[PDB]
Amino acid sequence: HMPNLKPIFGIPLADAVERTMMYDGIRLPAVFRECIDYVEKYGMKCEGIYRVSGIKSKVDELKAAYDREESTNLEDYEPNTVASLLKQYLRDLPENLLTKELMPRFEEACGRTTETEKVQEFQRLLKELPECNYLLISWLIVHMDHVIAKELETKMNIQNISIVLSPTVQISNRVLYVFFTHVQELFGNVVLKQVMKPLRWSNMATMPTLPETQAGIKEEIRRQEFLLNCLHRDLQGGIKDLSKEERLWEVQRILTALKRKLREA
């Protein structure tokens, strides 16, 4: 029969999206957000950010865990590791972000005599792209742009990211440099929406393992309630899945603790 039961590393974007839908299902895989989320929250002041090699021994476990639909607490892993898992994940995806179709035109648009001519070409390229690709290209480049500012503190430069991001989407070095530069020239309101992440807690038995900080609970509750109300509502669309339900009590149980501690801090 078909090899393996639902893979993850080596599928089209939508296929990955439908598999890894977390919040609203804004047409985007979870993996990408999970990795962008960690870097945005914790991996912002990391030297070697996206530059150092991730521990392949951890990465191969992660890709396995995702492919097996398991629990991956990236908040306990190294930034280089998740970043390496991410860039690999993007590689494994058959359809490029810019596809085979538009990809060769990025070389063209990079060799434009004027910054305006470049962005215009990239503009038409990105429009050809599917919705999922459009959003993927937005976040990947915009998030890495903010990483360039972080490079300004982590003692790195656009060139460094460009070197390591080239093998990522399969496009020449100079195109990444121009990618960010033009990415805000094209977008700029593009926002890096972070996600509620699994805890190091096994979600039962214990209790004194939760964040005891007020601002910590405030932010998390906000993020979690949006996850909560949406998932609950999903079921009302004629959906009766035990897996969705299990996660429904899951979010509720955790938020219950948070709601208590909210007025407990």
Side-chain angles (χ1 to χ4, degrees):
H1 56 89
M2 292 297 298
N4 188 30
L5 287 308
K6 299 190 189 63
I8 288 293
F9 290 71
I11 50 180
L13 279 177
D15 294 70
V17 173
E18 299 298 275
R19 195 71 239 138
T20 60
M21 269 191 171
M22 290 192 287
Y23 271 79
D24 345 75
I26 57 178
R27 276 51 174 187
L28 201 65
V31 187
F32 179 87
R33 292 175 298 237
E34 291 172 71
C35 306
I36 257 57
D37 161 272
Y38 177 82
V39 184
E40 199 72 323
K41 286 144 53 184
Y42 303 113
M44 276 279 97
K45 302 193 192 73
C46 185
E47 297 78 8
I49 188 62
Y50 272 79
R51 169 62 182 165
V52 180
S53 181
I55 306 177
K56 302 181 181 184
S57 305
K58 310 295 177 184
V59 180
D60 188 70
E61 179 67 73
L62 298 166
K63 52 184 274 293
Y66 280 83
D67 198 87
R68 290 171 293 178
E69 297 190 278
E70 277 287 77
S71 190
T72 34
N73 176 214
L74 310 183
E75 324 298 273
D76 197 72
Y77 284 73
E78 296 293 274
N80 53 324
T81 304
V82 297
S84 190
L85 186 283
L86 177 62
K87 61 168 58 183
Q88 238 307 148
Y89 172 81
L90 307 167
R91 289 170 47 106
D92 298 322
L93 304 200
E95 185 184 272
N96 288 91
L97 313 176
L98 317 312
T99 73
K100 320 293 180 60
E101 309 174 283
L102 294 314
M103 180 165 294
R105 297 190 62 113
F106 285 74
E107 300 293 308
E108 309 288 76
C110 189
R112 294 303 86 144
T113 188
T114 309
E115 209 67 285
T116 310
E117 328 308 283
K118 309 199 194 69
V119 304
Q120 297 305 329
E121 180 61 65
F122 296 122
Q123 279 188 31
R124 67 96 68 249
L125 271 12
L126 305 187
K127 310 315 283 173
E128 301 295 327
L129 318 188
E131 183 68 275
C132 45
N133 304 37
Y134 200 63
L135 295 176
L136 204 299
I137 196 67
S138 300
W139 285 29
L140 184 63
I141 308 296
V142 172
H143 187 259
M144 231 56 63
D145 154 273
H146 291 21
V147 177
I148 314 309
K150 307 312 289 178
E151 292 192 288
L152 297 179
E153 47 186 88
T154 64
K155 313 313 193 168
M156 293 168 57
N157 188 34
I158 318 178
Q159 181 246 212
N160 287 267
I161 293 304
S162 299
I163 299 176
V164 299
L165 199 59
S166 178
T168 300
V169 300
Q170 314 320 274
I171 312 181
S172 312
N173 179 273
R174 182 175 290 171
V175 186
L176 285 309
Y177 182 95
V178 69
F179 250 119
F180 314 118
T181 44
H182 82 240
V183 85
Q184 307 291 269
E185 293 311 289
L186 306 188
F187 318 99
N189 54 222
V190 166
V191 66
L192 293 310
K193 301 167 60 66
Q194 70 159 93
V195 182
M196 174 64 59
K197 309 294 279 300
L199 301 178
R200 187 186 291 135
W201 186 35
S202 301
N203 285 28
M204 83 297 122
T206 346
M207 274 279 71
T209 178
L210 310 171
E212 302 181 291
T213 43
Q214 183 51 266
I217 303 173
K218 285 295 189 64
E219 296 295 280
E220 236 51 273
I221 288 183
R222 183 267 193 216
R223 304 167 185 142
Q224 197 169 329
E225 291 199 290
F226 288 118
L227 184 64
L228 187 150
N229 78 140
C230 194
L231 308 199
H232 199 294
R233 192 169 311 136
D234 173 79
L235 301 180
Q236 285 74 91
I239 303 184
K240 181 62 179 180
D241 283 282
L242 182 63
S243 190
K244 302 293 285 291
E245 298 184 273
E246 296 172 70
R247 287 304 194 211
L248 190 55
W249 333 318
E250 188 85 77
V251 61
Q252 292 168 32
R253 180 56 59 149
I254 297 293
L255 264 181
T256 298
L258 295 180
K259 292 297 178 63
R260 297 183 59 207
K261 301 197 61 65
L262 188 64
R263 292 306 196 170
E264 192 187 65

